Every structure is written in structure tokens, then in C-alpha cells.
């Protein structure tokens, strides 16, 4: 017997004694360490109803993560709410790791173990378990990265689908590389993708979306305007931040199908997503920075007004890392034991 309940977790990690990446400092002293002999336990003839969209789970893996950070990457100047702090900003060792989410004595976590499951409504497939399985804190616009991949379908998750102002989170089940170098201008970057595997993907998608949208005809076009952060897809590569335009991601023509190259630059002044503010860095270290990364998931924007035309458009969203950690955390849910 259990009911519905909110209450403090507490993260696991195989975080590195030893090492001097950040996430590693970060999980040794502010995680324990993973539970070694991991039980889950299925539910016999339970149905149990999740939300991904309101889950508490969530709101406490941003806290975390933004502490990760205030406490690891610090810019040479932060400027927030006209106050200025100019700190020590060295060049750091940044890779994410998986962190846990496990419930204290009295509470366990619910596990939706439906292959088809959208993130809201009933679950007929439920187990028990003491922690989530690793979830990588990977922050980034646009495109979800380094995550897990829908088992069966590819999935349409959103709060409202009607509702055109609520993010479209798109649940890929086939991972498409996505590799990005500076050289050893020392800012210019790019990313190179798979044309034929995107393509391929992308097609997919449309027609996910077309089963949502009563077959309507799928479009994409480029972000409507904003901070550079999000019309970008932004992200963080070993500590520097890139940011890339994915403009050919997302045409919709697709004499298409080979190396798909997106123009990069790494800037040393941002926009921060823990909170309104902007931060600076200093330039980027020298040599070949690379990073090659699955892309698992994709954030969404749906165009308004189209409620008596033939076409549905959408724009590559992001900016509210919540929606990052909802794609994981999606098919969790914490319980009080009655
Ligand atoms: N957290 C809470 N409680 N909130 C309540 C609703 C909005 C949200 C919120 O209050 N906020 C304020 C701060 N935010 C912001 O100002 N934004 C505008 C500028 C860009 C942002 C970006 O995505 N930055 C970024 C930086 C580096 C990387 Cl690598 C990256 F992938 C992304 C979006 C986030 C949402
Ligand atoms: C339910 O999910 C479990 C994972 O715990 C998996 O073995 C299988 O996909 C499902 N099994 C049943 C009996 O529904
Ligand atoms: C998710 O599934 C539930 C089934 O109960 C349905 O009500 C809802 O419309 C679905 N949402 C999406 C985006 O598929
Ligand atoms: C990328 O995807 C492949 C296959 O989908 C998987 O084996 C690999 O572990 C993934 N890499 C990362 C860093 O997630
Ligand atoms: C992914 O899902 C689509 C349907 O959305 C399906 O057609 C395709 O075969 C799936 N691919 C894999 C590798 O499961
Ligand atoms: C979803 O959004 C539409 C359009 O904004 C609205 O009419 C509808 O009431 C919403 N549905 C729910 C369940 O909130
Ligand atoms: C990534 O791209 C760089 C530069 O083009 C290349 O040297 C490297 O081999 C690529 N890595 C993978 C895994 O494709
Ligand atoms: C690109 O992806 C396709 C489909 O997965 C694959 O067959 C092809 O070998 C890939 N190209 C390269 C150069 O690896
Ligand atoms: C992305 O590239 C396209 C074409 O190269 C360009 O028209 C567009 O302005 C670029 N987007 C941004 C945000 O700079
Ligand atoms: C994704 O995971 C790979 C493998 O650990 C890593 O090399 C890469 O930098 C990661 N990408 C991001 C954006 O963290």
C-alpha cells in the first residue's frame, strides 16, 4: 500500500575519488555511492497512473544540477540582477556522469515499464525500485543528448499537444551521432552528422507527428527568434560552449544524403540557463576539442495560428532544462508506503 507523495532524494554515483572532473567531485561529496546490488521489483496486476509533466523528481534534479554547476564551472564574471562578481575562472575537466535518484526509508520509486508509454496516464507495467538507473546531467538546446532511446516506437511526449505554447519532447529509438571538433579563429567549430542516418530519422519523426495530427503535412523551419542560446543548438564540450546552427538539420527537402557539416562557435559570453543572467569564460584551451555525442531526443516547438491551414510547423526548442531531465525521468514516479 502506497499514495502519491513528494519527498528529498538522495543521488548514487560511481563518481571517481580520484578524479579531478568536476561531475566526479561534485557526486563524491554530494552522492553516495551506487547500490550495489540494484533490486527491482515487478508489480502483479498494477496499474498506476504517472505524470511527467508534474513530477517533483524533476524540480530536484535541477536544483542539483545547477549546485553542480555553480559549484564547478565559474565564469570569470557573472552579472545577475545588476549585481557583478568577478571570480576565479580556470579551465576545468568537465565530462557528465550518470547520477541515481533514490527515495529514503518509507518511500519507493515507481518504474513504468510500458514500451509505448507517452509520460501521462496509466501504466499497466509497474515495478518498485530504490533508484533511477544513471541519468547523465547533459545540458544543451534543441537536441537531447547522450540520453536513453524509446524501446519500440519513436514517442511524442508533451503536456498539451493542442496547447501549441507547451514543448514537444520527440523520444528517438535509433541514436544518430553527432560529432563536433574545434581544430587545434580559434572560436570557429562544426559538427559533423550522418546525412543518410538523420535524414532517415527525421523522416520517422514526420510521420510520428503526422499520426498525431491527423496526417497533416509536416514542417519544419528554423527558430522564430530568441537568445542565441536557442536558436542554437547550444551545449557544453569539455567546459567550452558551442553553440551550432542546425538550419540543415531541419529542411525539409531532404542530391542531400552525405556528411551533414553545421557551422559552430564556441563563445566565451552566455546566456545561463540556472537562472537570468549572463556569464564569461575564458577562451577556449588550445588544441583539438572534440566531443561525439548520441542524439536521443528533440525539443520542439509547434507554430500557433495554423488552426484552419494544411500545415503543422515546428521549431527546435529548448532553454528549460527541466525538459531535459523530464525525458528521463519521465517513467518515474515517487510513492509514500502507506
Ligand atoms: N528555473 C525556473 N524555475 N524557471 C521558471 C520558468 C523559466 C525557468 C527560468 O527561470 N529560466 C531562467 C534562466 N533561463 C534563461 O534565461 N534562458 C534565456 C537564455 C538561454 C537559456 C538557455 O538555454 N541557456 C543555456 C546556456 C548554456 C547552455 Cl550549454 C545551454 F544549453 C543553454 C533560456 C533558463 C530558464
Ligand atoms: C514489463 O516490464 C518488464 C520490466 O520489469 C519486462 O520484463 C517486460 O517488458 C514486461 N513484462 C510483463 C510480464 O509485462
Ligand atoms: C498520452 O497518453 C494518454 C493515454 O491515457 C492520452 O490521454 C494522451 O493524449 C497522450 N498524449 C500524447 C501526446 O500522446
Ligand atoms: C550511443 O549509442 C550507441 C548505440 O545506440 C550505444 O551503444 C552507446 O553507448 C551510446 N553512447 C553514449 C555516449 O551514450
Ligand atoms: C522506430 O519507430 C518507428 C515508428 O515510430 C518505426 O517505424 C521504426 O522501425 C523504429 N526503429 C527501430 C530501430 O526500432
Ligand atoms: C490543451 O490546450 C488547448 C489549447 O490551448 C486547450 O483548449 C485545452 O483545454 C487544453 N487541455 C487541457 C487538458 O489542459
Ligand atoms: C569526428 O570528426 C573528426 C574531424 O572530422 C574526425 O577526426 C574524427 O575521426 C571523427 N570521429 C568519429 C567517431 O567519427
Ligand atoms: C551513414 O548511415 C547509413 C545508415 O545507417 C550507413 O549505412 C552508412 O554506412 C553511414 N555512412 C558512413 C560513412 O558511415
Ligand atoms: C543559420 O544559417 C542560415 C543559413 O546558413 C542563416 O540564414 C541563419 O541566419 C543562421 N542562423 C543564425 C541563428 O545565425
Ligand atoms: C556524450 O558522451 C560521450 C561519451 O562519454 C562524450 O565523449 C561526449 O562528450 C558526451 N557529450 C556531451 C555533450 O557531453
Redesign the pocket.
Known sequence: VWKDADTTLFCASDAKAYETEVHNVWATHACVPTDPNPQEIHLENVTENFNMWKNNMVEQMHEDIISLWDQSLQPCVKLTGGSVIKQACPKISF??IPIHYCTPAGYVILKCNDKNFNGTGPCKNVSSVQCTHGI?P?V?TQLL??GSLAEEEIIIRSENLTNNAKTIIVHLNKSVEINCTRPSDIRKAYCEINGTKWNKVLKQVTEKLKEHFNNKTIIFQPPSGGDLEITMHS????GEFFYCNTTQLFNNTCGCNGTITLPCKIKQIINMWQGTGQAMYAPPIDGKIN????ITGILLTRDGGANNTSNETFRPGGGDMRDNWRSELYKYKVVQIE
Open positions: 565530462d557528465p547523465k547533459v544543451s543528448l547522450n551545449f557544453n564540450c569539455r566531443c561525439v555525442s548520441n
